[PDB]
Design a protein around this ligand. Structure first.
Ligand SMILES: O=C(O)c1ccccc1C(=O)[C@H]1c2ccccc2S[C@@H]1c1csc2ccccc12
Length: 134
């Protein structure tokens, strides 16, 4: 077993705050913001050995990333950015940094009670997305 197994499972989005504003800051265009903003993704997190997989499934897009903590990888985001991603587990928080075009955004995922809370930050703008078990 591992600490990381607190995140494993199938999660459904229950609330969102400031996600349109976050996407604006990231540089997502109007039409993508509208359709992505309507998405209610389910997030499936699994671990096999050292490899963590996070899959997000919705009517907008289905995406999947697999990675080893601390080891950079190339990722194509749901909004079609080509980014360099590094994911670490710091003090029980999964911290995902994406770098592209001289820009950076950080996505933190934390357990809080029966929720999985996702905080996305792009410069000064934070979006909070709350998931519960499916
Ligand atoms: O939805 C989240 O909770 C989330 C948080 C951080 C990173 C990715 C996500 C996602 O799940 C992303 C995703 C992936 C597949 C299907 C639908 C969605 S909505 C969201 C997303 C759409 S454009 C964009 C542009 C920037 C960031 C997210 C996003």
């Amino acid at each position: 077993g591992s600490h990381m197994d607190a995140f494993v499972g199938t999660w459904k989005l229950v609330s969102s705050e400031n996600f349109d504003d976050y996407m604006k800051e990231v540089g997502v265009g109007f039409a993508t913001r509208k359709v992505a903003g309507m998405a209610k993704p389910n997030m499936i997190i699994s671990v096999n050995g050292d490899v963590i997989t996070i899959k997000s499934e919705s009517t907008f897009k289905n995406t999947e990333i697999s990675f080893i903590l601390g080891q950079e990888f190339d990722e194509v985001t749901a909004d079609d950015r080509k980014v360099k991603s590094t994911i670490t587990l710091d003090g029980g928080v999964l911290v995902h940094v994406q770098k592209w075009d001289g820009k950076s955004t950080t996505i933190k995922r934390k357990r809080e009670d029966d929720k999985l809370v996702v905080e996305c930050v792009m410069k000064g703008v934070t979006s909070t997305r709350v998931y519960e078990r499916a």
